[PDB]
Amino acid sequence: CTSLIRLKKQSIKYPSQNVYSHHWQSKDSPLTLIENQLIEEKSSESKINFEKLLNDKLFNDYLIRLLNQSIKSEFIEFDYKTSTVDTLEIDSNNTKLLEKIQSILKTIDSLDQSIDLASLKQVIIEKSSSFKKEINLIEKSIKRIVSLLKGGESEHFSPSNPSSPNDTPRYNSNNCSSKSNNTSSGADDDTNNEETINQLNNEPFNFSNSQFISNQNQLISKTIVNSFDRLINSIEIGEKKLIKIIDLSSIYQNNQLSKLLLLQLNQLLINLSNNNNIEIEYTIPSNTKNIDSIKEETKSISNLLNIKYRSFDLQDDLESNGYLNSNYDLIITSLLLVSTNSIDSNEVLSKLYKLLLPKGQLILMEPPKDVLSFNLLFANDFKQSLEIKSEQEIKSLIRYCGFTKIETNNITQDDEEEQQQPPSILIVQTEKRDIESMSLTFSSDPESLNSSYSNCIFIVSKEQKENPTSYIQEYFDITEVFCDNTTIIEAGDSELLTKTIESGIGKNDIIFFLVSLEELTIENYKQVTMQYTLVNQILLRNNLSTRFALLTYDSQNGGKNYLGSSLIGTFRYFLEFPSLNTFSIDVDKDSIDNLTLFLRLVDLSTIGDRETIVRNNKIFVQKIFK
């Protein structure tokens, strides 16, 4: 009699793929910023020489030459400059191009028409590292400017035909494709030299070869890894910590920043492979054009740092792509304000802010607008390059989206006998609004915590401090119960409880359970657990949107009340349902008075999961580690 399964006879295969542990780390980020008073570190020599490159009329003559050749490259025989015609688009001519060219030539005339780009060009090329791969960028700027303004446009902002009468404009640009490709060898035979107009167009702004961008990345990497060094040196005994780091410069700048980031992170952890009370979920998203470079540049770094090679595009919904509100701790972003056309910078900052954990660092390395030629190296069109703003505007926009402690880190180098310069790139590392104080809205205003709730019912026990006023005040005052109907219903009084919760309770109605704060006997805990289960059953059976927050004591790390875990377990069972919005908080005796904080804990937006521990006013979540 033969079976069909290989039989492993009582073997001992030491489980390595199935062990998951449980800890409790403080959800509010323990990450701490660096003091801006020490940001002096020299690695770049090309930025000082670039600021020296200004006020050099020979570069201006190079500008004149490029503008002349761009004027010539438009059309071989087309009129300009007095006359025919002086009109403008639209109705009807390409004279918008004519006026743009005349303004460009008006700027051209002053002031030099002499020899250019031999001596100073050789000197600067040998001085910084090479400026041929900078003149190429500045030339390709105007070359692709004329390529874009040529594009498919020289006309055709024409009025859409209003017929039929009262035809509202309807736009929809998805689910469209061309039919059909390569019919009768169309545009295939007799083809050659048809793509010479745009040949530097497919070669992007190169930053890897030159070492100045690498110096920028080195400064950023060292400043981040020093804070991480501080954190790991302040590691706690027997408490693993999960860190969610996402870098969005991996789609905008070269990966080199993240390259050195991973290199030094893994190097540091390898030098310090003696404690495993910390793990790092480092993640690198890309737009399906740098995933290849990212995954091929990194080979074996995932030893202790869980790496997730994914895709994040800032034009899609955060929740749709899987990213959640108050989900990830640290975000590092460079070349961001130069990377948008239609998205408001406040909207980009809101995108960054929503994902952030409480006080989670937002590192934003953005260019200032003190030198325009310095901004011409970050975008290739008249639109994105000027989407950048000044330092004060960046600060105000960061404070606009609810950020505290803006840290201005002006990258400062110091080359001897070489002039000073404005900051090479402004680095602002701010933190999310402190989890101690928010409101349910996006920006802090206590309208949602005060006089926003209509009915707040309190489950109490009349076996200690029979009066409910002092029973609640025994742990936190009753005055902070801010609702139009301060109601208290006896524990076990489920009939009037059913009547009250079935007559109607609004979305801003909450029910705190203060019976799980006393030391439960060896029999009564089943009784109160049954009461709770019936309460949640009646809540769900009518599909209500009531907010519930259970408050328990010492029932999630062991102590005087180890019996509330039954309540917590059945509550956990209910959480799989979407109709029942319920939370649970375990607090000690010495931090039990934070009623306003508990009201804040109803936040699905700025706070994360629906189970937390408050110790010494610090909010914790349980983390499970492979």
Three-state SS string over 524-541 comes to: HHHHHHHHHHHHHHHHHH
Query: Which residues, in sequence order, are bridge partners of residue 485?
Result: 455
Kind of pairing between the strands at 581-587 and 403-404: unpaired
- Backbone phi, then psi, for 297, in 5-degree steps? -75, -30
CA–CA gap between residue 92 and residue 55 (Å, rounded): 41
The residues, any chain, with a CB within 8 Å of residue 271's CB and separated by 6 or more, are none
Alpha carbons 27 and 30: distance in angstroms, whole number: 8
Cα 334 to Cα 203, 253, 362, distances in angstroms:
21, 7, 11
Choose among 393, 416, 275, 411: nearest CA to 345. Answer: 393
User: Would you mind telling me the total number of residues written for the chain in this entry?
Assistant: 626
DSSP state of 23: E
Q: What angle do CA 621, 622, 626 make, to 5 degrees?
A: 135
Name the 3-class secondary structure at 429. strand
> Which residues touch 576 (CB under 8 Å, ≥6 apart)?
none
Sign of CA dihedral 311, 317, 319, 324: positive
The position carrying tokens 């020489």 is 49
Enumerate residues 6+ apart whose C-beta is below 8 A from 32: 227, 230, 231
Segment holding 426, helix H or strand E: strand 426-432
Residue 239 per-residue DSSP state: -
Cα separations in angstroms, 518 against 84, 457, 458, 599: 92, 19, 15, 21
Helices (H), 44-85: 46-53, 57-74
Q: How far is CA 377 from CA 117, 139, 258, 428, in A?
A: 20, 11, 20, 20
Q: Which residues pair with 306 in a beta bridge?
A: 281
Q: Is 222 left (phi over 0), alpha (psi -120 to 50) or beta?
A: alpha
* Cross-strand pairs, 513: 459, 550
Cross-sheet strand order for the sheet of 547-553: 21-26, 618-625, 612-615, 581-587, 547-553, 510-513, 453-460, 483-490
What's the DSSP call for residue 250?
T
- Return the structure tokens found at 62: 């190079």
The encoded tokens of residue 266 equal 């893994």
Which tokens is 356 given? Answer: 């952030």
* Signed CA dihedral, 60, 61, 65, 67: sign only: positive
By the 8 A CB rule, do 276 and 282 touch? no
Q: Which long-range CB contacts under 8 A does 494-502 form with residues at least 24 apart? A: 494/531, 494/534, 494/535, 494/538, 497/457, 497/535, 497/538, 498/538, 500/455, 500/457, 501/457, 501/535, 501/538, 501/539, 501/544, 501/546, 502/538, 502/542
Rounded to the nearest 10°, the torsion over CA 244, 245, 250, 251 is 50
Q: What is the 3-state secondary structure (H, E, C) of 182-221?
A: CCCCCCCCCCCCCCCCCCCCCCCCCCCCCHHHHHHHHHHH
Task: Name the token pair of 460.
Answer: 């109490």
Q: 3-class DSSP state for residue 394?
A: helix
Instruction: For residue 242, list its beta bridge partners.
Output: 279
Query: Are the C-beta atoms of 95 and 86 separated by less than 8 Å?
Result: yes
Question: Residue 74, CB half-sphere, CA atoms under 13 Å: how many?
Answer: 23
d(CA 215, CA 128): 12
Nearest CA among 219, 135, 208, 222 for reference residue 426: 219
Instruction: Give the position of tokens 């981040």.
Output: 224
Is the N-terminal amide bond of 85 cis, ω within 30° of 0? Answer: yes
**Which residue type, as a one-letter code, is found at position 265?**
L
CB distance 230 to 58 below 8 Å: no
Q: What is the resolution of this structure in A?
A: 3.9
- The C-alpha atoms of residue 135 and residue 210 are separated, in whole angstroms, by 13
Q: Which residues contact 530 (CB under 8 A, 6 or more apart)?
A: none
The 3-state DSSP class for residue 612 equals strand
The two beta strands, 403-404 and 426-432, are: antiparallel
CB-based contact 280:265 (threshold 8 Å)? yes
Q: Which technique?
A: cryo-EM
Looking at 401-555, list the stretches that DSSP marks H as alpha helix, in order from N- to C-terminal side. Answer: 468-473, 494-503, 524-541
* Phi, psi angle pair for 350, to nearest 5°: -65, -40
3-state SS assignment for residue 493: coil
Yes or no: say if 559 and 595 are a contact pair by the CB < 8 Å rule.
no
Pairing label, strands 618-625, 21-26: antiparallel
Which H or E run contains 428? strand 426-432
Beta bridge pairs of residue 483: 453
Residue 363 neighbours by CB under 8 Å, 6+ apart:
220, 224, 330, 331, 332, 333, 427, 428, 429
Report CA torsion sign: 589, 595, 599, 603: negative
Coil vs helix vs strand at 81: coil
Alpha-carbon distance of 284 to 366, in angstroms, equals 19
The full DSSP string for 124-171 is HHHHSS-SHHHHHHHHHHHHHHHHHHHTT-SS--PPP--TTTT-----
End-to-end CA distance of the chain: 41
Structure tokens, 91: 């109705």
CA 333, CA 323: separation in Å to the nearest integer?
16
**Interatomic CA distance for residues 38 and 374, integer angstroms:** 25
Residue 244 tokens read as: 């969610």
Contact, 532 vs 567, CB < 8 A? yes
Using CA atoms, how far residue 549 sits from 77, 292, 533, 595, in Å, is 77, 46, 14, 11
Report whether 28 contacts 358 (CB < 8 A): yes
Distance CA 449, CA 427 (A): 35
- Write out the H or E segment, with its range, that includes residue 511: strand 510-513
CA–CA dist 539, 79 (Å, integer): 79
